Each structure stands twice: as structure tokens, then as C-alpha cells.
Amino acid sequence: NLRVLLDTAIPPSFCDTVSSVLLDDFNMVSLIRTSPADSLATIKQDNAEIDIAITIDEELKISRFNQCVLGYTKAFVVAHPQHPLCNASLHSIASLANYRQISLGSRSGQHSNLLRPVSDKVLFVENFDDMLRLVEAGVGWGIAPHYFVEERLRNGTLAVLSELYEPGGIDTKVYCYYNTALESERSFLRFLESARQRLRELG
Ligand SMILES: CC(C)C1NC(Cn2cnc3ccc(Cl)cc3c2=O)=CS1
């Protein structure tokens, strides 16, 4: 039995990519979704017995776990089209610190440099859905994966503020944290090679 953790920042496009591949090699495969805020918090619980985690969160070294990079993915800062900062000026991009952020909360109550909120007016949520509800209602700005915001952005229900900070949206690394047990196993290298391909082509 193999247990695999994918945070909700990973497109579910991808979540198909591993399933075919991993099950070529392995017999039981459990897929588990967490908040990116909870990805690393979870694997560190010995009892949770996670073997692989696909997460955007970065941490320098973790016990009993090697890191590597499967690929990259875009994220956008989004707000209500009529949000004060809709004018999207480099002045407005410094002012994020001043307007209310809808940030992802974490059970541990603790956040990495990566996912820690930026503004002091913060309101926490469990998933990117509650995030965008509140953002669609002009209650704040928030930073969400492409696949969540592509729908609403074409629909005009939502606006991007992040395009002068990083044109193209914000590339984020997708990390593979894997139990050291796996490094030698031809099983893993197979999955890794396949995994990288689909996130590439999914770009
Ligand atoms: C404050 C922004 C200017 C930036 N914050 C980040 C970190 N960050 C935060 N949440 C995310 C949620 C989802 C995804 Cl896919 C990525 C991120 C992310 O990178 C980068 S610039």
C-alpha cells in the first residue's frame, strides 16, 4: 500500500498523471488532498505514514524525507473587478499590505515564508473555494492557483492584480517530498519521469 498527498494547488489534471503511472508499479495507491498550508504539517506526523507528497510549500530539510522538483505552475493575485486596487498600479502592488487578504489557514496555526499572509488585515480559510467566494464578494484580495481562477477570469466575475509583479502569473515550484526508502527503488524514478512530463505538457 502506497499513500500519496497532493495539495489543492496541484491541478487535478496532474492528479490523473500519477494515478495511471504509479499503479503500473503499485497495487494499492491512496490519493489524499490537503490545504498547501497543511501538506508539510501532515507528512511530519509519523502516524500519517505518507510516502509521497506533491505540494507547492517549501521547507529546507524534513526528517526521513528527500525533496525534488516535478515542475512549475502559475498562480494569480485576484480581487473583485471593482476592488480599490483594480487600477493594478505598482503603487497598488505595494499596497496589498494594506487591503484585506483572504489567506489559507493551517491546522498547525503556523505558515511557511511562502504561504504566510502578507497584509495585516488577514481573514483565514480552509480551501481556495471559501477563498474566492469572499474575494468575489469584495471582502478581500487572495492568491489562488490558475485552474480555480481561469473560469471566473474569462467570466469577468474576478480580476488579476499580479501582472506587473510577475507577467504570466506567478510560477511556483511543485515539490515532490518522498520517504528516503524510495530513492533506490526503480519504482519511483519511473513515476518521477512520467510525473515531470505531464506537469510540463500541462503548463
Ligand atoms: C503575496 C504575493 C505577491 C506572493 N506570495 C507568494 C506566495 N504564494 C502564496 N500563496 C499561493 C497560493 C497558491 C499558489 Cl499556486 C501559490 C502561492 C504562492 O506562491 C508568491 S508572490
Query: What are the domain boundaries of the chain?
Result: 1-203
Question: Of all atoms in ligand 1, which is nearest to the CA of residue 75?
Answer: 15
Confirm if 121 and 99 have CB atoms less than 8 A apart. Answer: yes
What does each C-alpha distance from 152 to 111, 149, 155, 164 come to in angstroms? 27, 5, 5, 20
- DSSP symbols for 14-75: HHHHHHHHHHHH-S-EEEEEE-HHHHHHHHTSGGG--SEEEES---S-BTTEE--EEEEE-E
Distance between Cα 34 and ligand 1 center (Å): 16
Experimental approach: X-ray
Q: Is there an atom of ligand 1 within 6 Å of 170 CB?
A: yes
* 72 Cβ neighbours under 8 A, 6+ residues apart: 171, 172, 173, 174, 199, 203
Kindly give, in sequence order, each residue whose CB lies less than 8 Å from that of residue 134, ignoring residues fewer than 6 positions away. Answer: 102, 123, 125, 140, 142
The three-state secondary structure class of 190 is helix
Contacts of 4 (CB under 8 A, 6+ apart): 18, 22, 29, 30, 31, 32, 50, 51, 52, 53, 54
Look at the chain and count its residues. 203
Resolution stated for this PDB structure, in Å: 3.2
> For residue 96, which of 83, 108, 106, 109 has the smallest C-alpha distance?
83
Residue 184 cell numbers, joined: 533506490
Task: Tell me how far the alpha carbon of residue 93 is from its chain's centroid.
Answer: 21
CB-CB neighbours of 25 under 10 Å? 14
**Secondary structure percentages of the chain, helix, strand, coil, to 5:** 35, 25, 40
Q: Which of 115, 165, 174 to mutate to test the pocket of ligand 1 (most atoms within 8 A of CB)?
A: 115
Cα of 4 from ligand 1 centre, angstroms: 23
Q: Which helix or strand (DSSP H or E) is residue 189 part of? A: helix 186-202
Pair 34, 24: CB distance under 8 Å:
no
Nearest-angstrom CA–CA distance, 32 and 39: 10
Sequence-distant (6+) residues with CB within 8 A of 95 are 85
User: Exposure pattern of 54-86 as b/e (b: 16+ CB <10 Å)?
Assistant: bbbbebeeeeebeeeebbebbbbbbbbeebebe
Ligand 1 mean position, distance from CA 21 (Å): 29
* Topology of the domain comprising 1-203: D-Maltodextrin-Binding Protein; domain 2 (3.40.190)
